[PDB]
Amino acid sequence: TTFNYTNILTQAVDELSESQSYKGLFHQHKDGDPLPSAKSLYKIVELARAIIFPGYFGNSTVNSHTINYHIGVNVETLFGLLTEQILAGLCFGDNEPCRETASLLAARFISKLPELRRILATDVEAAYYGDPAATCFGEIISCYPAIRAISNYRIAHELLILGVPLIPRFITEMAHSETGIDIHPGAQIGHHFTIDHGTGVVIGATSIIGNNVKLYQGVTLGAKPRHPILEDDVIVYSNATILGRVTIGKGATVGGNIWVTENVPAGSRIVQRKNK
């Protein structure tokens, strides 16, 4: 039958089903190729967490007699899932991505989990030692948003290093959505890195962050190489913006709410002008 909305719907469909111009500058994606799945990617990052921090994300109840069994099953599930997503990435943006290539890259990534665990361990320690409000390594790994963002970042960075396209950005934007912390997979970040609270933090594509660095909520390391360099032991407080070819010397402190466009000598402190 024909209702008053019937022809409105059919006409809408006809218009939506064409667009010779809305073929956009969209290059051609081969039919049959799989597309990145946010769902699969979510599962991938969660398995990575469960493998890196066994028993915390790796099991609902504590059981020392099954830690290894779970690592074994989790690594296999991750391998299958990651192979497919890496294949989707290669296909997105001779070379007609065969699973063979994707499966080896996925295995290469997995071989990096022990190292990722070692690095993330220092990040958790830095988060604990410098946060009186933190009262356990377990509480930090279990619910602190910063560890999740940093974990996603290090996972994405490794994938980028291995040459997996698209997937790395997908993974960091995922953390961006869940934590409000936006770290570009290309950023370079040292050990014992910590982000306090973190909502609004933005770390640009070519940023270089040293060791034992701490950033607070709203801190931006951006531009407009062209991103800032923060040396070791640096602290940047709430909402400060650092942009361009700027180097924050080791041990320096950057007060909050300031637009920083000049180098900051090591061990110095820079704060906003007085208000009245």
Residues in 226-245 at the binding interface with its own copies, rule: CB under 8 A: 237-241
Rg over alpha carbons for the chain, rounded to the nearest Å, is 22
Distance separating alpha carbons of residues 185 and 183, to the nearest angstrom: 6
Q: Which residue in the set 20, 93, 95, 96 belongs to the binding site for its own copies (CB under 8 A)?
A: 93
Distance separating alpha carbons of residues 242 and 240, to the nearest angstrom: 7
Minimum separation from the CB atom of position 192 to its own copies (A): 14
Contact 167, 86 (CB under 8 A): yes
Nearest CA to 154 out of 192, 125, 199 is that of 192
Using CB under 8 A as the binding rule, the residues of this chain from 16 to 45 that contact its own copies are: 16-17, 19, 22, 24-27, 29-38
Minimum separation from the CB atom of position 196 to its own copies (A): 8
End-to-end CA distance of the chain: 72
Q: Which residue in the set 70, 191, 208, 249 belongs to the binding site for its own copies (CB under 8 A)?
A: 70
Tell me whether residue 116 or residue 209 sits nearer to its own copies (CB atom): 116
Minimum separation from the CB atom of position 206 to its own copies (A): 9
Minimum separation from the CB atom of position 98 to its own copies (A): 12
Binding of its own copies by 107 (CB under 8 A) = yes
Tell me whether residue 179 or residue 229 sits nearer to its own copies (CB atom): 179
> For residue 44, what is the enclosing H or E element?
helix 38-52
Distance separating alpha carbons of residues 44 and 139, to the nearest angstrom: 22
* Maximum Cα interatomic distance, the chain, rounded to a whole number of Å: 78
Distance separating alpha carbons of residues 17 and 66, to the nearest angstrom: 53
Residue type, 15: E
Contact 249, 267 (CB under 8 A): yes
Binding of its own copies by 71 (CB under 8 A) = yes
Stretch that binds its own copies, among 152-160, 192-200, 244-252 (CB under 8 A): 192-200
Using CB under 8 A as the binding rule, the residues of this chain from 151 to 170 that contact its own copies are: 166, 169-170
Residue type, 96: E
Q: Which residue in the set 205, 208, 246, 266 belongs to the binding site for its own copies (CB under 8 A)?
A: 205
Stretch that binds its own copies, among 154-162, 212-220, 244-252 (CB under 8 A): 212-220
Using CB under 8 A as the binding rule, the residues of this chain from 124 to 143 that contact its own copies are: 125, 132-133, 135-139, 142-143
Q: What is the DSSP string of 137-167?
A: HHHHHHH-HHHHHHHHHHHHHHHHHTT--SH
Stretch that binds its own copies, among 99-107, 156-164, 244-252 (CB under 8 A): 99-107
Q: Which residue in the set 258, 263, 265, 266 belongs to the binding site for its own copies (CB under 8 A)?
A: 258
At residue 83, what are phi and psi to the nearest 5 degrees?
A: -60, -45
Minimum separation from the CB atom of position 166 to its own copies (A): 6
